[PDB]
UniProtKB/Swiss-Prot annotation:
Family, similarity comment: Belongs to the bacterial ribosomal protein bS20 family.
Subunit: Part of the 30S ribosomal subunit.
Recorded name of the encoding gene: rpsT
Domain of life: Bacteria
Record's protein name: Small ribosomal subunit protein bS20
GO biological process, one term: translation
Length: 86
RNA sequence: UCUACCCAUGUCCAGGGUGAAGUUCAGGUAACACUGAAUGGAGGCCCGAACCCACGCACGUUGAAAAGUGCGGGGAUGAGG
RNA sequence: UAAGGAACUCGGCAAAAUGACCCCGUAACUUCGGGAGAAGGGGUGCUCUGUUAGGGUGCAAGCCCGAGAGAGCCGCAGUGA
RNA sequence: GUCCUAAGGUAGCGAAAUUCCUUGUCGGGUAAGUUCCGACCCGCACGAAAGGCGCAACGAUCUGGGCACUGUCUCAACGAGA
RNA sequence: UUUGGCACCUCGAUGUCGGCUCAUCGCAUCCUGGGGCUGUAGUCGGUCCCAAGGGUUGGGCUGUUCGCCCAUUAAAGCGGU
RNA sequence: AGUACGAGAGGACCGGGAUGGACGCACCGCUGGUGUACCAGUUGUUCUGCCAAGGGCAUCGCUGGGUAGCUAUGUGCGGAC
RNA sequence: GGAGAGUUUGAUCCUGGCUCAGGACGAACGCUGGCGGCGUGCCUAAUACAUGCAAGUCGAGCGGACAGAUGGGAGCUUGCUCCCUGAUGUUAGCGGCGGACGGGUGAGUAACACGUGGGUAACCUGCCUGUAAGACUGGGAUAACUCCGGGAAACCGGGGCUAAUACCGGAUGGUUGUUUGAACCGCAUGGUUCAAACAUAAAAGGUGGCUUCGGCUACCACUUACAGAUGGACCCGCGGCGCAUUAGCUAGUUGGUGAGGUAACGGCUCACCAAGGCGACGAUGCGUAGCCGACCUGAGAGGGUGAUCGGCCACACUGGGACUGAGACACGGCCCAGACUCCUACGGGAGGCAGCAGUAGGGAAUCUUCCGCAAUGGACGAAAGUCUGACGGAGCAACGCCGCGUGAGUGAUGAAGGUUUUCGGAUCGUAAAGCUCUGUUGUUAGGGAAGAACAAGUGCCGUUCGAAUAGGGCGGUACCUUGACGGUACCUAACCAGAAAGCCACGGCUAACUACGUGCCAGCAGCCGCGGUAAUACGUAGGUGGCAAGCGUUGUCCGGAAUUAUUGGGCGUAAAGGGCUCGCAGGCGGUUUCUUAAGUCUGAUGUGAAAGCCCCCGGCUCAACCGGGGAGGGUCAUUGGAAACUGGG
RNA sequence: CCGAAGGUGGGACAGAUGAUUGGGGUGAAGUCGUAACAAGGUAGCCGUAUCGGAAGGUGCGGCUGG
RNA sequence: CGGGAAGUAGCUCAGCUUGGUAGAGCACAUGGUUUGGGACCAUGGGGUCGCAGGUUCGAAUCCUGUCUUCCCGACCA
RNA sequence: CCUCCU
């Protein structure tokens, strides 16, 4: 940039994204664990995965990444699959 | 007995493609036109071996041969061989 | 056969290049048939899914034909001559 | 106007498979084009079934220009066989 | 070296234009070397003299020789065989 | 030496030095070319009984490389004094 | 609430064009030019840009340098030095908010972009202000600073550290999801309210004062729910461009089903199915264009425009993409590509004037490289304040509109003085000659604006919190303070009406003539037309109606033009009946009665911003201007009637 | 995987320009004839054909606006 | 390159071949004409013969050079 | 058969 607070906002936002991507990745990985568990026929693990998923989901909401409606949509999708197993 | 043309009588032409007329059905109109689809299988039609021809080049030129060979080339259901 | 690429030559003569199948796509002009394989592009091996879908034959068993997909694997290159 | 004729060449095309002069002139294409294409018309010496002018398709036809392609060439080198 | 004149060799054959390949010779010198004169200030030139050692381009058009043109070059010589 | 010369424009001789073009000689260390008794990949079919691994033929089957040798477009040197 | 005129003929009536008088403007060009007050000023090249400036702030988040010194210390030339970290200050760097606003331009867009229409049951909604729970308990890293290595460099990578109101762990959290049922229902998809379980999810403290040093506070402020509000998103009816010498278009195209994505509904994306969708009521294509409030014109219907000013939209050197978040898929960011500018010792960096000024270029043509945040509004902050080319001012330019003027008034020589000539004149002309009276303004010196509300700082008092008298905040209440313009507007007072009149037109339309010089020449011309040796329209010279420092000329639009005719025209001979049928669609349709109620009509309710123009219109001395209450505004909803007529049975 | 820019290709459309060529308009006093307007000296005009320097002529059919 | 032919007023041409004379048409100017024109009629002005040299008593004329413009010719089998 | 321009 050619402004002081622009150069800060350049340097800031890069460092934010890295940290932010972590939590999305963590969430998406935690979502994959639940999805993977449906194939293997193992509800007991899927519940314990869904908690860790739900934690990682809601951490992104706090930071300001996943919208409350976005989170609402995900936890819906997962819970229907878990109940659809039994 | 070569060759030109003709006459009688035989015979040959691997394969593949294209898709004329007609027909049927559907649409279509007062009738016809006309349209589509399917079917159909025309042609000195197409690509291409055999076969027939002989366009280009090279070679050969006291030749392997008094007209050929090699590599390409043209026709190849026809006014065909 | 380096680099170049018709500068050669009367003249690209000769040679090189193109070349199969499937798919996409294809202008002027036209006698409405054509032009047309116009042009220009893409795909092409092998393995598994797979004795695939589907088809022929058969009472079946079996034998034969066989797309199109998906996932891979290898090479400089798969109509590998 | 005048002379001559049987009648004086229409349409179309034209430096042409025809044009001597001639590489006509102008334009196009090329760095450069006696060839080629388009124009023009002083047609030496086109011209209407010894047809005129066009024309899709067709051609081992002739001509000019491109892309590709190459030992055709710059300029030649090596290898195989006879 | 031209066009010719003559008709002497060759009509029981002296292949005939241009190009390609290979040159070689002359000098009336295109370039380079050396000079004189200049209407030679310089840089360039002009003109004549000496000099034949070596050098003297690739293309477009045309069968062309020649020529014109493009682009170069120190120069793009003229002739004989 | 922007010296001489010239109003300027321009712009030398003579003398130093560097580096080319064309031409020639040699040579393969380098860059490349070729390299049919080198190495490798690969198609079809056929043979070594079969598998695996190989051989034959298909332009050296084709394709990618390549040693020596021979080579130019490559390198060195020459026409100096 | 609506005016015509000239011009076809020898003359006529008609048809028919042409031209003129009006108004308008972002104007340009001539010639000319005094001042003032409001307004306006790249319409061309969304061309390229030298230079400067246009968004920075919070030290009461922050460790840290670097200062401060109230004091002790301080060797001692009283000259200078100092050793401790004073209250606290300056705040590179970290963290927060803003930077998505404000400002600019209209390139693209024929589209739910816009103007008038819904879900809000398809959404979102930080900040602000309420009502409703909390900041409890885990640490671990990292800038700066330093150490090391780079970079001539520009810029930067490692190492050990340190902080934070930066970040992450865990409990319990009404939100959220899931499930278990209810309650209650709508416009189908449903929605709203309640209860338990399972799962998940919270914070942050920095200031000043008081601590009984247990803590308890309070402005600020961190975090959670139900609100309100605000600003966005999607969807839809209906509207508003040209060309058929553009007739077929489409293949995620049209619908389904499923999956995914999205704040959100949805071919929005994809998989798998079908075969649809659109179009003569104009699809598709091409062209042109931001739309609207409005603006110009007109009796109105209409027509044209969409500079300035307000709203919606779109864009930000060209093009693509996401990140951050409540919110850009960024106007002074980044990532990548491209064309241009800059730097680079060549490895690599930096930027986008459609921000204000300015430059070049283009062009008929459009400003100052200005001063100030005093005012208004922002951002930041608790505040002081800082930043603000937004904004206020000023510069420039007759580019508009208009001021109130540039006097009033007494005064007949009709003088002076003019160009004509029937050698005489006549009009300007009560206007000046000679004045003589007043200060709208200004000719020069003295007074002097308003604009300023203040915000705070301070002093006080009711209220609510307060362990509380702390100590602040919020209602009434003092005191306090600041002006770019600018010593500028406006007043007084002289020198004094001195400084302040103009331009254009004068055949006719449309109120306004003669000498001379040309001689179809030179020239003129909106139209009709003038000039060939007596030119009331040409060259010159002397002479006069409108509006008022300008008005002529050219350009554009509406009018006149009942001249595209719905209002409001035509087709025997002026332009105009298809050569004539058969007919698809379409348009139109006898009489009665019944019924219907789409059209038709009608009542009631909601919106159609602000400005502008306008009805009453007021205020500012009237103005060249600002406020309120109305009205218009709809082929518009929703609902209740009426039912003759048109339509349906 | 998608994907801007770029590359390649064959078409579509629009503008500019082009040797030359075609009519058209305009232009005080050019050349040729005299076609039309009168029965315009062959009544004219419409469609069509053909011919001719040029207006035009001629055929066929039509019209009266003879 | 060689050979021809031109070159005369503003423009187009005679005169050149046989030496003595500068003409013609159009344009230009003036007059006539007419209201004024146009056309027509009459009357003028305007070169020194592309440039230079030569021969001659004397050169547009004959000879040469030069410049400009045309025309013709220019292997060979 | 024709009858210059204003
Ligand atoms: K050639
Ligand atoms: K041919
Ligand atoms: K002989
Ligand atoms: K070698
Ligand atoms: Mg055949
Ligand atoms: Mg064949
Ligand atoms: Mg053969
Ligand atoms: Mg080669
Ligand atoms: Mg090569
Ligand atoms: Mg050649
Ligand atoms: Mg050659
Ligand atoms: Mg060949
Ligand atoms: Mg030529
Ligand atoms: Mg060639
Ligand atoms: Mg003949
Ligand atoms: Mg004959
Ligand atoms: Mg003899
Ligand atoms: Mg003999
Ligand atoms: Mg000699
Ligand atoms: Mg070796
Ligand atoms: Mg080698
Ligand atoms: Mg094997
Ligand atoms: Mg064998
Ligand atoms: Mg064999
Ligand atoms: Mg636009
Ligand atoms: Mg009207
Ligand atoms: Mg008539
Ligand atoms: Mg009529
Ligand atoms: Mg009729
Ligand atoms: Mg007549
Ligand atoms: Mg007659
Ligand atoms: Mg005749």
């Amino acid at each position: 940039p050619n402004i002081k607070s622009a150069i800060k906002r350049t340097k800031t936002n890069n460092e934010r994204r890295v940290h932010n991507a972590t939590i999305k990745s963590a969430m998406r990985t935690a979502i994959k664990q639940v999805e993977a568990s449906v194939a293997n026929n193992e509800a007991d693990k899927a519940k314990t995965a869904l908690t860790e998923a739900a934690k990682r989901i809601d951490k992104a909401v706090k930071t300001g990444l996943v919208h409350k409606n976005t989170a609402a949509r995900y936890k819906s999708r997962l819970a229907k699959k878990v109940n659809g197993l039994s």
